[PDB]
Design a protein around this ligand. Structure first.
Ligand SMILES: O=C(N[C@@H](Cc1ccccc1)P(=O)(O)C[C@@H](Cc1cc(-c2ccccc2)no1)C(=O)N[C@@H](Cc1ccc(O)cc1)C(=O)O)OCc1ccccc1
Ligand SMILES: *[C@@H]1O[C@H](CO[C@@H]2O[C@@H](C)[C@@H](O)[C@@H](O)[C@@H]2O)[C@@H](O[C@@H]2O[C@H](CO)[C@@H](O)[C@H](O)[C@H]2NC(C)=O)[C@H](O)[C@H]1NC(C)=O
Ligand SMILES: *[C@@H]1O[C@H](CO)[C@@H](O)[C@H](O)[C@H]1NC(C)=O
Ligand SMILES: [Cl-]
Ligand SMILES: [Cl-]
Ligand SMILES: [Zn+2]
Length: 586
């Protein structure tokens, strides 16, 4: 009955706090200090948490969920019935945990070396090469080398990973791991909804793609860019060509309206990783949102250790299920890109702090996209020329329609280009998980989607043994990706809603919500719900309506769409890549 059910969830919450806190501690210790010992302690703590998950999950399944009145209780129990990997038999669970460890370790310690020269790590060395080199061959060296070293090394693990994650999913009542991941949205129409949103961003993406392609043609040469074909994947300023704003210098709409070198500005003005996170902290509190506790400053890892010791650099935000202990682990570089990343990560921290008083079972985003969006929303305001000038990182850019188009381009290179990338990652993984793509076809099907959605081609033909997906963090780390597609759509809906609540008029892209208590209150009420209600309720609290919608993002970028159509038309661009079979000749 009802009494036994609420007693069970009370017990689950107390015991889970302790066990998850211990697990998080050991996971943190490994991530911030990769050694045999920390690896050993982590794999053992995996047994402890799996023990706990099994005890409570087993009990939870004995409840017939739909004989239960209270919906919150009903919700916690159905959630605890999913054992995740702890559903696996002992032998397989051991193997699965080791596979995950080996994949994440392989990715985070991989280096690319010059023969009898220096070896480069992904962060910051290879990231910098991809961002700043303008030499075709040097970009290719980094692009291919990273795949050769990280991607190829992951392949040995992946088929067994897929087998075991699917097995766990079936043991929890799903048909495969991709089914399990999609269920996080509790939205039957999810796939159709995402396809519709993607299609809505097509006019903008194709126009951006055509314009950038033309600019690359100008720089890298006619013999290396097909004006009617896909773009070589190593030329977009980013290892995965997922965000393109590092090639802003190659594509600036009005070079007569230069922008201040923001990296130079931050360096000269003595900016440090600590200052970057303090600025993000200030933006959150300016909205009437929560400051990070003193403990955050004590315990976080805000730059790469110089100890020589090895870490997982890929940025992350950590809840220790204390209601007290929250940490970021980021190998912060002093530049504008990492200032934005800091805001992204501080977004997750804010969410942790807002829902800290809920049962741990409900300590999640309304959906995973909500958790990813919070930090990015504030970052949209931080990124405005007006705000950056206030931080002394840009000079006065206001008024000028030239600076205005330039700013919109700078934003589109990231926000619009990322749409097809974020969409395709889990299109690939869902089909791996459902058995549509086998290990024979992993890489070929990845490039088929790279072509279909982003209109990119690999600069060097792929060969047997390549596994380019393994060269992207989220693949060996088994972190779902569709959350980021959702985030990019909804963060603009949030921006639009918060801006109108803040009383801002005129073009959406001119909005800066700094210090708006009205905007802060909307975000806080939504975040406080955690995972306690269907996500459309949190959507409603922020935006006044319950749907995901591209209209806000389209509205933000409307002036750029008009500019790009006019520009592309006057140059006679053919939108898309009708010569889709094109690959580099040399
Ligand atoms: O810490 C995370 N998640 C991190 C990933 C993760 C998850 C589990 C275990 C380990 C790690 P991230 O997404 O913050 C880590 C962030 C890092 C990051 C990079 C950049 C970036 C933007 C522009 C140019 C260059 C870089 N922006 O954010 C991430 O991966 N982002 C995706 C997607 C992305 C997001 C925002 C964005 O602007 C661009 C891309 C990526 O790097 O591919 O989740 C915390 C949490 C959430 C919900 C519940 C519990 C805990
Ligand atoms: C359904 O139950 C929720 C949860 O109740 C809490 O957790 C249970 C395990 C048990 O320990 C209860 O005594 C707890 O109150 C109720 O939501 C709570 O309601 C109170 C009072 O309004 C509120 O202050 C709390 O914040 C709520 N907690 C959560 C986690 O939402 C809810 O009222 C019940 N619904 C109905 C219709 O009775
Ligand atoms: C790294 O881990 C080892 C155990 O493997 C530990 O003794 C050492 O103190 C750790 N280093 C740091 C800097 O925490
Ligand atoms: Cl790739
Ligand atoms: Cl997700
Ligand atoms: Zn994130």
């Amino acid at each position: 009955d009802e009494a036994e059910a609420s007693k069970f969830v009370e017990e689950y919450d107390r015991t889970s706090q302790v066990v998850w806190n211990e697990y998080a501690e050991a996971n943190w210790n490994y991530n911030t200090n990769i050694t045999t010992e920390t690896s050993k302690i982590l794999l053992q703590k995996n047994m402890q948490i799996a023990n706990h998950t099994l005890k409570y999950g087993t009990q939870a399944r004995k409840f017939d969920v739909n004989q239960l009145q209270n919906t919150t209780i009903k919700r916690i129990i159905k959630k605890v019935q999913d054992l995740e990997r702890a559903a696996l038999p002992a032998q397989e669970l051991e193997e699965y945990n080791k596979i995950l460890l080996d994949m994440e370790t392989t990715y985070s310690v991989a280096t690319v070396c010059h023969p009898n020269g220096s070896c480069l790590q992904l962060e910051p060395d290879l990231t910098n090469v991809m961002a700043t080199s303008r030499k075709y061959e040097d970009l290719l060296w980094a692009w291919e080398g990273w795949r050769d070293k990280a991607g190829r090394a992951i392949l040995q693990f992946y088929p067994k990973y897929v087998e075991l994650i699917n097995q766990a999913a079936r043991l929890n009542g799903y048909v495969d791991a991709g089914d399990s991941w999609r269920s996080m949205y509790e939205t039957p129409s999810l796939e159709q909804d995402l396809e519709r949103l993607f299609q809505e961003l097509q006019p903008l993406y194709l126009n951006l793609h055509a314009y950038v392609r033309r600019a690359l043609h100008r720089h890298y040469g006619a013999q290396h860019i097909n004006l009617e074909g896909p773009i070589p994947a190593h030329l977009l300023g980013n290892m995965w060509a997922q965000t393109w704003s590092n090639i802003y210098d190659l594509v600036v709409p009005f070079p007569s309206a230069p922008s201040m070198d923001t990296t130079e500005a931050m360096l000269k003005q003595g900016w440090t990783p600590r200052r970057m996170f303090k600025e993000a902290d200030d933006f959150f509190t300016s909205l009437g949102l929560l400051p990070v506790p003193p403990e955050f400053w004590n315990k976080s890892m805000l730059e790469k250790p110089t100890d020589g010791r090895e870490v997982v650099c890929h940025a992350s935000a950590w809840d220790f299920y204390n209601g007290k202990d929250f940490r970021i682990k980021q190998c912060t570089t002093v530049n504008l890109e990492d200032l934005v990343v800091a805001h992204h990560e501080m977004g997750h921290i804010q969410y942790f702090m807002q829902y800290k008083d809920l049962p741990v079972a409900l300590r999640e985003g309304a959906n995973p996209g909500f958790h990813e969006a919070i930090g990015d929303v504030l970052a949209l305001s931080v990124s405005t020329p007006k705000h950056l000038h206030s931080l002394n990182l840009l000079s006065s850019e206001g008024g000028s329609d030239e600076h205005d188009i330039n700013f919109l381009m700078k934003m589109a290179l990231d926000k619009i280009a990322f749409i097809p990338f974020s969409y395709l990652v889990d299109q690939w993984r869902w089909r791996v998980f459902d058995g549509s793509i086998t290990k024979e076809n992993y890489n070929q099907e990845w490039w088929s989607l790279r072509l279909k959605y982003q209109g990119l081609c690999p600069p060097v033909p792929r060969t047997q043994g390549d596994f380019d997906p393994g060269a992207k963090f989220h693949i060996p780390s088994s972190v779902p990706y569709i959350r980021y597609f959702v985030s990019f759509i909804i963060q603009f809906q949030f921006h639009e809603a918060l801006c109108q609540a803040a009383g801002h008029t005129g073009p959406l892209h001119k909005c800066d919500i700094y210090q708006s208590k009205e905007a802060g209150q909307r975000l806080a009420t939504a975040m406080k719900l955690g995972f306690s209600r269907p996500w459309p309720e949190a959507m409603q609290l922020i935006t006044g309506q319950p749907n995901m919608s591209a209209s806000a993002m389209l509205s933000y970028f409307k002036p750029l769409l008009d500019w790009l159509r006019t520009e592309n038309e006057l140059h006679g661009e053919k939108l898309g890549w009708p010569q889709y079979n094109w690959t580099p000749n040399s």
